[PDB]
């Protein structure tokens, strides 16, 4: 039987936990309170990631149905369409983007099992979420850093799963900003201002850029080639930094906390092996990341979905 989704909450109140201008020094107390406040969201995201992972792994329609039953409950309860409560920063909005990433990627993965009733419940819910998220980015005072790319992935997954061309194009626009932000040395100007977490935030930025490239690949478009394979410079900068932080330690003037590459390597190593520079990262899998779609090792190996369109 399918266990009970936790009640969907209209409101989000997350808590920002960096204390420096560079967004790099953590207040453990604020971080812990943010964890506690967001635990139910994070549980739900982990669970729809996992049940959609079970469906991709063996094609058991029961796993697909239970995923759809959880997504449907939240759609019915208007979860996350309430007030983004501002404590000290935009953490509630950032959390809505991350949560749309998880649920829209969960829905995509199980979409070929969605009956017309379920599609009619889930699609408008994801559409409202995506459009609310885009409305934030219409304000030219909002700095388009990695939050824009992470927002883009949820919008693009939503555009694909629900056949919304406007959301697809808005998805692509966020991908393009990331690609256009990559300098010749493979850095992102806004991620280079993050002190000891500059290397972390280069991997953080890359990972949704790769997942958006992979969704475009489903639709039969190559986005990887954009601006002369500019993404390859970021991917190279990040993996070289995973082995040797010296470049980041010089360019930022701050000792980098050490990076282990996140599960984008699962896709990127098939697209551009660059003489195997990602094999070390791969050996540390399988890679699980609810906000990127869940089991990135399985989706890399067998596909983000079990059947096309």
UniProtKB/Swiss-Prot annotation:
Q: Which GO terms describe its biological process?
A: polysaccharide catabolic process
UniProt keywords (A-Z) are: Carbohydrate metabolism, Cell outer membrane, Lipoprotein, Lyase, Membrane, Palmitate, Polysaccharide degradation, Signal
Enzyme class, top EC level, equals lyase
EC annotation? 4.2.2.-, 4.2.2.3, 4.2.2.1, 4.2.2.14
Question: Sorted alphabetically, which InterPro entries does this protein's record hold?
Answer: Alginate_lyase_dom (IPR008397), Chondroitin_lyas (IPR008929)
| Zinc-finger as UniProt keyword | no
Known regulation of its activity is: Is inhibited by mono- and divalent cations as well as L-ascorbic acid 6-hexadecanoate.
| Subcellular location(s) of the protein | Cell outer membrane
Q: In this UniProt entry, which residues carry a covalently attached lipid of the kind S-diacylglycerol cysteine?
A: 2
pH-related activity info reads: Optimum pH for enzymatic activity is substrate-dependent, with optimal hyaluronate degradation at pH 5, poly-beta-D-glucuronate degradation at pH 7, and alginate degradation at pH 9.
Question: What name does the UniProt record give this protein?
Answer: Polysaccharide lyase
- UniProt source species: Stenotrophomonas maltophilia (strain K279a)
């Amino acid at each position: 039987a399918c266990p009970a989704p936790p009640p969907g909450q209209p409101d989000i109140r997350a808590i920002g936990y960096y204390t420096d201008k560079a967004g790099s020094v953590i207040d453990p107390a604020l971080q812990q309170q943010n964890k506690d406040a967001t635990a139910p969201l994070d549980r739900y995201a982990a669970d729809v990631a996992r049940m959609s992972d079970d469906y991709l792994r063996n094609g058991d329609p029961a796993a697909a149905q239970c995923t759809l039953s959880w997504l449907g409950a939240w759609a019915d309860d208007g979860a996350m369409l309430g007030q983004m409560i501002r404590v000290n920063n935009d953490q509630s909005f950032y959390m809505r983007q991350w949560m749309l990433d998880a649920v829209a990627m969960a829905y995509l993965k199980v979409h070929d099992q969605a009956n017309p009733q379920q599609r009619a419940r889930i699609d408008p819910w994801l559409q409202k979420l995506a459009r609310a998220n885009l409305a934030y980015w219409d304000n030219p005072k909002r700095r388009r850093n990695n939050h824009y790319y992470w927002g883009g992935l949820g919008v693009l997954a939503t555009g694909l799963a629900t056949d919304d061309d406007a959301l697809w194009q808005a998805g692509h626009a966020a991908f393009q900003k990331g690609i256009d932000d990559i300098q010749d040395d493979g850095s992102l100007p806004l991620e280079m201002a993050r002190g000891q977490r500059a290397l972390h935030y280069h991997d953080y930025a890359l990972a949704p850029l790769v997942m958006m490239a992979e969704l475009a690949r489903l639709r039969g478009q190559d986005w990887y080639a954009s601006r002369n394979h500019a993404i390859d410079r970021l991917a190279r900068r990040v993996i070289e930094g995973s082995r040797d932080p010296a470049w980041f330690n010089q360019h930022t003037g701050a000792a980098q906390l050490p990076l282990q590459a996140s599960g984008w390597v699962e896709f990127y190593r098939l697209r551009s092996p660059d003489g195997g520079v990602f094999d070390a990262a791969h050996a540390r899998g399988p890679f699980h990341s609810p906000r990127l779609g869940g089991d990135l090792t399985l989706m890399a190996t067998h596909g983000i979905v079990r059947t096309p369109l």
